[PDB]
Design an enzyme around this catalytic site. Structure first.
Site, PDB file in Angstrom:
ATOM      1  N   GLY A 167       0.829  -1.219   0.000  1.00  0.00           N
ATOM      2  CA  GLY A 167       0.000   0.000   0.000  1.00  0.00           C
ATOM      3  C   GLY A 167       0.854   1.256   0.000  1.00  0.00           C
ATOM      4  O   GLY A 167       1.753   1.363  -0.858  1.00  0.00           O
ATOM      5  N   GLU A 227       4.328 -13.600  -7.343  1.00  0.00           N
ATOM      6  CA  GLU A 227       4.725 -14.601  -8.375  1.00  0.00           C
ATOM      7  C   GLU A 227       6.200 -14.405  -8.755  1.00  0.00           C
ATOM      8  O   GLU A 227       6.887 -15.411  -8.992  1.00  0.00           O
ATOM      9  CB  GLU A 227       3.858 -14.486  -9.635  1.00  0.00           C
ATOM     10  N   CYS A 270     -21.706  -2.807   1.264  1.00  0.00           N
ATOM     11  CA  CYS A 270     -20.850  -3.668   2.122  1.00  0.00           C
ATOM     12  C   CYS A 270     -21.299  -3.560   3.584  1.00  0.00           C
ATOM     13  O   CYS A 270     -21.464  -4.617   4.223  1.00  0.00           O
ATOM     14  CB  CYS A 270     -19.381  -3.303   1.970  1.00  0.00           C
TER      15      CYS A 270
END
Ligand SMILES: O=Cc1ccc2cccc(O)c2n1
Ligand SMILES: [Cl-]
Ligand SMILES: [Cl-]
Ligand SMILES: [Cl-]
Length: 281
Positions: free
Chosen positions: A63, A113, A258
């Site tokens: 972040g 990855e 939400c």
């Protein structure tokens, strides 16, 4: 097509706290401000990782660098952050250079990855919903293999229930929640996929991790989404002129939506701890 849903960092600034944390806050004690509660959430995660001076912490989806900075300052550790945002990369490099420490601080513009360096501990806060179902085996294998014998990881993720569990609360709410999840995964986090807690736990176990009972942050996300909603609502005019009425409407729907589905217990937020076999007692 998904690019149409790309939104400037300026917009998020108009509903998030000053740290610009885009994840569940932790209101312990209950009457913390959003900013203080975002720090409390970072501490909740780091306090489970058995961090000792001189260890290296990997932050997957680092972040704006808040977790990494707190880790260096509280635990005197080296940090490596992974992000796919250039803006976040730039901010993070400057946040980390700002810290008065001898510890190694590195931020990388890449996904997990492409990461294969030994680290002691891993933290990942609400990046995991932006991976993909078919990727989960590779993710836990990678995390297991890059950590030492006493390795630990926390993953904090928003979570759905398997269609079968949702049907248990009646078909009406199930189909209704399924479509809202579709909306989040199309227009809020394009190409995203909400895992179940069960998936997060079982993929961890398959990789060889010990997984204690996950912590539910449901009540803390309700409070978070309420403040975000109220904050965005109070900055409507400012928000519209920075993007469009279309985008404000989209995010108000997201935040109010939400809040509703977290309240109705059709959505959850899980902080899952993954302990390697040799993890401290
Ligand atoms: O320069 C603008 C900017 C960019 C990213 C940020 C993150 C956290 C806090 C801030 O003030 C930020 N400011
Ligand atoms: Cl976006
Ligand atoms: Cl953002
Ligand atoms: Cl590997």
């Amino acid at each position: 097509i998904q690019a149409h849903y790309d939104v400037s960092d300026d917009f998020f600034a108009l509903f998030q706290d000053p740290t610009r944390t885009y994840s569940c806050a932790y209101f312990e004690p209950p009457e913390l401000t959003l900013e203080e509660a975002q720090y409390a959430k970072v501490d909740l995660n780091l306090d489970k990782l058995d961090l000792k001076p001189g260890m290296t912490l990997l932050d997957i989806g680092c972040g704006w660098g808040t977790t990494m900075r707190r880790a260096v300052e509280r635990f005197d550790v080296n940090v490596i952050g992974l992000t796919l945002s250039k803006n976040q990369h730039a901010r993070c490099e400057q946040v980390l250079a700002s810290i008065d420490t001898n510890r190694s601080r590195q931020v990388l513009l890449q996904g997990w990855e492409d990461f294969a360096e030994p680290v002691d501990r891993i933290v990942s806060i609400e990046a995991f919903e932006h991976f993909g179902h078919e990727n989960y085996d590779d993710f836990f294998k990678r995390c297991f293999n890059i950590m030492p014998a006493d390795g630990r990881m926390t993953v904090q993720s928003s979570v759905s229930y398997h269609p079968y569990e949702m049907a248990a609360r009646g078909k009406k709410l199930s189909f209704e929640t399924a479509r809202f999840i579709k909306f989040i995964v199309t227009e809020i986090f394009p190409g995203g996929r909400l895992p179940s807690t069960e998936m997060m736990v079982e993929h961890g176990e398959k990789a060889g991790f010990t997984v204690p009972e996950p912590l539910s942050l449901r009540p803390h996300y309700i409070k978070t989404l309420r403040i975000w909603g109220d904050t965005l609502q109070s900055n409507k005019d400012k928000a519209i002129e920075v993007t469009s009425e279309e985008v404000y409407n989209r995010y108000m729907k997201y935040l109010r939506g939400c809040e509703h589905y977290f309240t109705d217990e059709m959505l959850d937020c899980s902080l899952v701890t993954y302990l390697k076999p040799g993890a401290a007692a």
